[PDB]
Scaffold this active site. Structure first.
Site, short mmCIF file in Angstrom:
data_model
loop_
_atom_site.label_atom_id
_atom_site.label_comp_id
_atom_site.label_asym_id
_atom_site.label_seq_id
_atom_site.Cartn_x
_atom_site.Cartn_y
_atom_site.Cartn_z
N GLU A 155 12.78 -11.14 3.94
CA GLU A 155 11.57 -11.58 3.26
C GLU A 155 11.88 -12.12 1.86
OE1 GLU A 155 9.60 -10.10 0.56
OE2 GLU A 155 7.92 -11.50 0.85
N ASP A 210 2.16 -4.68 2.24
CA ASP A 210 3.20 -5.01 1.25
C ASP A 210 2.85 -4.42 -0.13
OD1 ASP A 210 5.49 -6.11 0.16
OD2 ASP A 210 5.02 -8.20 0.68
#
Ligand code: FE
Length: 325
Positions: A155, A210
């Protein structure tokens, strides 16, 4: 209108999803400890974390896929491996919960990324473990819905965040699934007017966690498309508070994580390559980011445990409501 009728959780189920025993606390923390290590792409501890995720979910009789590949980066060629765990592979539609398991390669020193995203990783595994019996029962229904967990690799940017340097695993996986063709006839119990042409169409909604674990996160609805799903999170939180099941610093307070207010903010994350391919997204990320964001202080001691507990109750109730556990 949302393609699935969203039936409100019964009180009995709300109360159960909202209690957290000390062994619940203990189990989550034991899970979390496995992730509170540096997880840089390509490293030994990174492979150990992936092995831990894979074994944990295989132990629960989930189908687990490792989607591995090599990709060019500003630091040269790197190996990446997304982990996809699916409770019932045959079920046409998936409620997808996701996060990333790699940690930022920080220029100053060892970076733990406790909120980013060790806590979200542990929350997904904890959900699978704590709801296991109910999930195993739900899987036998033949109702064409299942739970799917995706732990994205790569990511983080290696250098300056850009379209080419970020989201390595999610970019790879979204493309892979988009190009893998299938149809409703090959699958178990698709909804009536479902348009299914490829694997990406089976993703009913992607709930991306997140930067969780810090005190007082503020969430907003980032997508009108998923406002019906988002509002269930608002409603669950409200019900938990009404029942006195949230941990607060003083009596007669309420959590307010999931705002009903509108926002006009845009955050790049693992949802982007899916969003571009018409997957409905709920983006559970705080705004503003934790003050610890991308600093060496994003560590274990700066986690706020009462908030983590409250979030776990919301997520457990949410999954339970969506899958009608
Ligand atoms: Fe980050």
């Amino acid at each position: 209108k949302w393609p699935r009728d969203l039936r409100p959780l019964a009180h009995h189920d709300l109360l159960y999803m909202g209690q957290i025993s000390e062994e619940d606390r203990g189990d989550f923390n034991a899970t979390l400890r496995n992730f509170l290590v540096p997880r840089v792409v390509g490293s030994q501890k990174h492979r150990e974390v992936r092995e831990f995720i894979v074994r944990s979910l295989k132990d629960l009789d989930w189908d687990v896929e490792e989607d591995c590949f090599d990709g060019q980066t500003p630091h040269g060629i790197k190996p990446f491996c997304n982990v996809i765990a699916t409770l019932n592979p045959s079920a046409c539609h998936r409620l997808v919960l996701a996060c990333h398991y790699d940690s930022l390669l920080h220029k100053e020193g060892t970076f733990i990324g406790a909120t980013d995203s060790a806590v979200p990783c542990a929350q997904l595994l904890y959900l699978a473990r704590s709801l296991n019996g109910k999930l195993q029962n739900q899987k036998t229904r033949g109702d064409g819905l299942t739970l799917q967990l995706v732990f994205f690799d790569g990511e983080e940017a290696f250098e300056r965040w850009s379209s080419h340097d970020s989201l390595y695993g999610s970019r790879h996986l979204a493309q892979k699934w988009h190009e893998d063709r299938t149809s409703a006839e090959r699958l178990e119990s698709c909804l009536e007017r479902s348009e299914i042409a490829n694997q990406i169409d089976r993703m009913e909604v992607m709930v991306l966690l997140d930067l969780l674990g810090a005190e007082n996160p503020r969430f907003y609805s980032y997508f009108g498309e998923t406002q019906p799903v988002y509002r269930r999170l608002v409603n669950i939180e409200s019900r938990l508070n009404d029942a006195g099941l949230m941990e607060l610093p003083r009596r007669r307070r309420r959590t307010n994580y999931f705002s009903n207010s509108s926002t006009v903010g845009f955050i790049e994350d693992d949802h982007i390559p899916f969003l571009k391919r018409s997957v409905p997204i709920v983006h559970i990320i705080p705004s503003p980011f934790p003050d610890v964001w991308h600093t060496l202080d994003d560590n274990e001691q700066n986690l706020h445990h009462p908030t983590i507990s409250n979030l776990n109750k919301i997520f457990k109730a949410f999954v339970s409501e969506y899958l009608q556990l």
